[PDB]
Chains A and B, each alone.
With several copies, the nearest count.
Chain A
Amino acid sequence: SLTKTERTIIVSMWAKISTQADTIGTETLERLFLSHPQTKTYFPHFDLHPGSAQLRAHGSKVVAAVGDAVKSIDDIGGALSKLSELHAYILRVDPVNFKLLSHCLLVTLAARFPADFTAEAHAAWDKFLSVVSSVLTEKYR
């Protein structure tokens, strides 16, 4: 349920995010792991130390995924189909964690694009990330 305005805010903000995708992805994960240590257990095979190459490569894939959701904002479910199956059947990630990652991304955005991160932008992104999180956990319902 995204209004036309909210949708443009997501597209506009995405344009800027895509030019700093790699750093935004890495910072988001660092915030997640540090603020919510429980999330680290999903990456036992990962080098989660600062500047890590795995983390950096992974953070890039995550933001790219968010980008696909932007490109397919009208059918996020279809776009992220493969990922929802992976996170539910294979990774079995606790739904609460998606809310935690969403919060951390919002923090990264607010700190990186203060001028663009208004209340409305915030509401639009929270709503968008809620749909992305809902789609990724749909396999539990």
Chain B
Amino acid sequence: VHLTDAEKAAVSGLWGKVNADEVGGEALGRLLVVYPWTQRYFDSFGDLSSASAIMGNAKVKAHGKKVITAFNDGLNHLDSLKGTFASLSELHCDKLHVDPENFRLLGNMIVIVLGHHLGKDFTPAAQAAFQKVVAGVAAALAH
């Protein structure tokens, strides 16, 4: 989970130009829409019967906030993802029973959303940086 300073910057800058909370809610929503089975862990959130519905679901956007917040924490500690997410890991593993492959999916959703918001600013080099970050976060969560 290393990052060239040049990259360390990109992630630091670009993550600033974006509205974190929107990213999380949109990333989660895309996850539920693109991979309908991930909905199984969210019967509570209510109506997830369709895309527009899912993307407009209050409980979905609200949870994205917490997911993006946690993601942000691991973003401030790209050197200790191990313990940073350790608590969550056992929660997603032993209590929620989420197959670790899914963490990787949400990470892809986050990457796609960032490209959706930052447009041309989310360049190849920039994506690589964030991918390494995303890859690291998912690794920690499953580990």
Contact = CB atoms under 8 A, between A and B. Distances in A.
B64 interface: no
B34 to A, nearest CB: 5
Nearest to A92: B40
B35 interface: yes
A92 B39 contact: yes
Nearest to B31: A119
B68 interface: no
* Most B-side CB within 10 Å, residue of A31, A96, A97: A31
Interface size classification for chain B: 35 or more
A95 B97 contact: no
Contacts of A103: 108, 111-112
A92 B97 contact: no
Contact of B97 (A27, A41, A119): A41
Interface in A16-73: 27, 30-31, 33-38, 40-41
A83 interface: no
Interface string B32-63: 01111111100000000001101100000000
Contacts of A119: 26, 29-30, 33-34, 51-52, 54-55
Contacts of B99: 38, 94, 96-97
Contacts, number: 90
B34 A123 contact: yes
* Most A-side CB within 10 Å, residue of B30, B102, B118: B30
A12 to B, nearest CB: 16
Nearest to B117: A114
Nearest to A95: B37
B116 A34 contact: no
A118 interface: yes
A85 interface: no
A88 interface: yes
B44 to A, nearest CB: 15
A79 interface: no
Interface in A89-139: 92-97, 103-104, 106-108, 110-112, 114, 117-120, 122-123, 126
Interface string B106-143: 00100111011111101011011001000000000000
B35 A122 contact: no
A81 to B, nearest CB: 18
B49 to A, nearest CB: 12
B101 interface: yes
11 contacts: A30-B124, A31-B124, A35-B128, A38-B99, A88-B36, A92-B37, A94-B102, A96-B101, A97-B99, A110-B116, A117-B116
